[PDB]
């Protein structure tokens, strides 16, 4: 598909997918291994109503 712009035209490509879990029961299991960093300061901030 395509559309106009400042510059010039723009071509978006999309193909449809579809999917199903085969199997009865659990097929994948995931596990956490390490903690990299906190991402949050793990600190002192209050709340302000």
């Amino acid at each position: 598909a395509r559309h106009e712009t400042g510059g010039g035209v723009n071509f978006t490509l999309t193909q449809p997918r579809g999917n199903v879990d085969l199997g009865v029961g659990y097929t994948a299991v995931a596990a956490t291994a390490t903690v990299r960093n906190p991402v949050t300061d793990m600190g002192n901030l209050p709340q302000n109503f």
Binding site: H3, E4, T5, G6, G7, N10
Partner: protein, 308 residues
């Protein structure tokens, strides 16, 4: 697209021509709708009224008159800008380069402003031919209308020097999201502040009608809600004259079938409702991004579509 060409004339040095290369996506005000035009009609030297450069309330009145055009492309001997006031009819959305500390979001109507921030301000000088270019600052209409109000009131408060002591309120500082925004306080000119005051005073009068008195009855009722709802509490700003205005029908109904409430709303809505627009230039564009990016960083190109 009725593009208006703008001829770079003759001598243009390599450093100056490199300055115009990065001016694509910026905005120009042309004093006509033309096909052939001179580079000097766009320059800030053309904004000069008789003998005098307009102040920063004078520019708004100059940008009121003439037509905003967003530069699309710049060629060796011409500048192509399509006059948004007219030639906005493009299937997709001309690029606006966000020049501002601010950030557009998606759907924000974009009205322009003379450069007005302490840290910022784009004027690009060109030494080969005497001329300069101040590019207006695009800005959401909520913010651009807060600024104009600041400049208007500042020109009005400094007009009759304040009787009261010499320490006045700020009015020079805003906030958009976080990010304190400090306006430029520099000069105010009689004529520029007069018209801005003249049309402010004029319109706030026409918004008062017979049915308006029926509404002024409700001030004691508002403050009853000031205090028992968390909204309506927020509505009334702490510095609210209305709060100080309470610190009534008058019979006089002319035959009883007019509906002055309804008529009072319409009257107020026209004149007072449309004040951002008359004091400043109203939005003609609104950010729209096809790729689904939902903001525009400062300095980026904002895909822009016709009027909100």
């Amino acid at each position: 697209c009725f593009e208006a060409d703008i001829a770079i004339p003759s001598g243009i040095s390599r450093p100056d021509a490199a300055a115009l290369q990065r001016c694509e996506g910026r905005v120009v005000f042309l004093p006509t709708i033309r096909r052939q035009l001179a580079l000097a009609d766009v320059a800030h030297e053309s904004f000069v009224s008789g003998g005098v450069s307009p102040d920063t309330l004078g520019l708004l009145l100059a940008y009121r008159r003439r037509f905003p055009a967003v530069i699309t492309r710049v060629l060796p001997t011409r500048i192509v800008a399509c006059p948004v006031d007219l030639g906005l009819t493009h299937a997709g959305t001309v690029n606006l380069r966000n020049t501002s500390p601010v950030d557009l979001c998606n759907g924000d109507p974009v009205s322009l402003v003379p450069p007005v921030f302490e840290g910022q301000a784009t004027d690009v000088r060109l030494e080969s031919l005497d001329l300069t270019l101040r590019f207006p600052v695009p800005l959401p209409t909520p913010l651009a209308r807060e600024i104009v109000a600041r400049l208007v009131a500042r020109g009005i408060r400094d007009l009759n020097p304040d009787r009261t002591p010499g320490e006045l309120p700020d009015l020079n500082v805003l906030y958009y999201n976080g990010a304190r925004l400090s306006l430029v306080a520099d000069v105010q000119q009689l004529a520029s502040v007069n018209t801005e005051l003249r049309s402010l005073v004029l319109n706030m009068v026409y918004s008062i009608t017979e049915g308006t008195t029926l509404i002024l009855t409700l001030i004691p009722r508002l403050l009853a809600l000031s205090a028992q709802d968390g909204y309506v509490n927020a509505l009334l700003q702490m510095q609210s004259v209305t709060r100080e205005a309470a610190q009534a029908p008058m019979l006089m109904q002319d035959g009883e079938r007019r509906l002055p409430l309804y008529e009072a709303l319409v009257a107020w809505l026209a004149h007072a409702g449309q004040l951002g627009d008359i004091l400043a230039l109203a939005p003609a564009v609104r950010v729209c991004t096809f790729d689904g990016a939902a903001v525009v960083q400062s300095g980026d190109m904002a895909p822009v579509i016709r009027y909100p």
